[PDB]
Design a protein around this ligand. Structure first.
Ligand SMILES: Cc1cc2nc3c(=O)[nH]c(=O)nc-3n(C[C@H](O)[C@H](O)[C@H](O)COP(=O)(O)OP(=O)(O)OC[C@H]3O[C@@H](n4cnc5c(N)ncnc54)[C@H](O)[C@@H]3O)c2cc1C
Ligand SMILES: O=C(O)c1cnn(-c2ccccc2)c1C(F)(F)F
Length: 337
């Protein structure tokens, strides 16, 4: 289990927060998972599940058994020609899993290229980028019920996916995701809305891009645009794009013509949270070891040595400021512990 007592979690979270865990364990299959659960209950410690720690804000030492999800395995479950059911263990790194699928001639994940973290965590916040969400390709997952240690299958409906949401984020600490099955395709027409990805592919002379072509562009753009936690600690975008009803939307639009929004299919307008933050004057803000990125206004950052409490406090000031200015509450994307 590679059990360690009073272990620094600093290399295990992309924010780079240095808090200690009472017990740190690395799980490399379901047996290790069941063992750690027995251990946590034996020692009367809660169990905190961690993947790549890239959606995690740790604010204090962790009096719990921290289980690092490191199980390995990727496989084609069944080939149906135009679609292919693939399966990966929870501890599989997400982006190497995307590449594994693309090397196999499968499409569906290319817009989710270069997202950090693990396969296991991906259903929890319904990972999404470039107009694609995990739920678009999701077939099923196997999860351990942490109430009674049974195994349950969740199909797409049972997962109650939502924008950066899922049953598992709503019922926290209840389900331990062990492996995830996705339906990828071959020979589908690549649907790409106007934007920088499509523009770069046109520049490369590519009017019918393969999934691999799309993935190469999106990797390049993300490596150009998004701070790397390796250099500057962060958990990606800190806030979700908030929705407003047509009432608040027309009022905010009357107060700001430059208001960057997205009209939804249900009639509401999803606001661009980075615009709220930028126009709050927050872009590039720094306060000691924490700050907001000078260009990606959604990315709160640890310049080095920050505590999670310092990050949370900065997030709270931005939230309160945006509340006080725009009448809009920014929800966080990372999970705070
Ligand atoms: C630079 C950077 C860029 C990012 N870009 C995006 C993006 O474009 N789109 C997007 O959606 N997200 C993005 N993220 C957020 C993060 O990468 C995703 O949310 C990812 O799915 C988190 O996976 P993880 O393994 O690191 O989860 P962790 O951070 O390790 O865990 C996050 C939550 O999931 C729980 N959890 C983890 N594994 C399991 C498991 N097997 N079973 C049950 N619960 C579990 C954890 O308890 C925790 O609550 C980015 C993060 C960073 C640092
Ligand atoms: O929608 C997208 O296409 C997209 C493209 N990059 N990032 C992004 C990811 C992490 C930090 C900041 C931005 C997004 C998203 F997270 F906002 F979702």
């Amino acid at each position: 289990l590679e059990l360690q007592e009073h272990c620094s979690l600093k290399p295990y979270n992309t924010f780079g927060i240095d808090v200690r865990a009472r017990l740190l364990a690395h799980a490399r299959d379901e047996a290790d998972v069941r063992e750690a659960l027995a251990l946590a209950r034996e020692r009367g410690l809660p169990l905190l599940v961690i993947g790549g720690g890239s959606n995690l804000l740790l604010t204090r030492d962790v009096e719990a058994l921290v289980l690092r999800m490191a199980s390995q395995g990727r496989r084609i479950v069944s080939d149906a020609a135009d679609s292919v059911l693939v399966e990966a263990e929870a501890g599989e790194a997400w982006d190497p899993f995307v590449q594994w699928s693309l090397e196999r001639g499968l499409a569906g994940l290319e817009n989710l290229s270069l997202i950090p973290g693990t396969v296991g965590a991906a259903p929890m916040q319904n990972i999404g980028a470039y107009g694609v969400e995990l739920k678009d390709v999701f077939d099923s997952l196997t999860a351990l019920d942490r109430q009674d240690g049974t195994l349950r299958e969740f199909d797409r409906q049972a997962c109650r996916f939502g924008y950066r949401d899922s049953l598992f984020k709503q019922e926290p600490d209840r389900w331990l995701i062990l492996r995830v099955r996705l339906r990828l395709t071959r020979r589908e027409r690549l649907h790409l809305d106007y934007g920088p990805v499509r523009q770069r592919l046109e520049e490369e002379g590519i009017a019918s891009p393969t999934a691999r072509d799309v993935s190469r562009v999106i990797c390049a753009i993300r490596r150009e645009k998004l701070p790397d936690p390796a250099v500057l600690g962060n958990a990606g975008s800190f806030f979700k794009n908030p929705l407003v009803d047509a009432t608040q939307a027309e009022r905010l639009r009357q107060a700001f013509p430059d208001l960057v929004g997205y009209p939804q299919a249900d009639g509401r307008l999803k606001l661009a949270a980075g615009w709220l933050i930028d126009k709050g004057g927050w872009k590039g803000f720094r306060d000691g070891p924490v700050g907001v990125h000078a260009q990606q206004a959604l990315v709160l950052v640890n310049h080095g040595g920050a505590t999670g409490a310092q990050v949370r406090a900065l997030a709270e000031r931005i939230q309160e400021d945006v509340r006080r200015r725009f009448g809009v509450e920014l929800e966080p994307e990372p999970n705070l512990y």
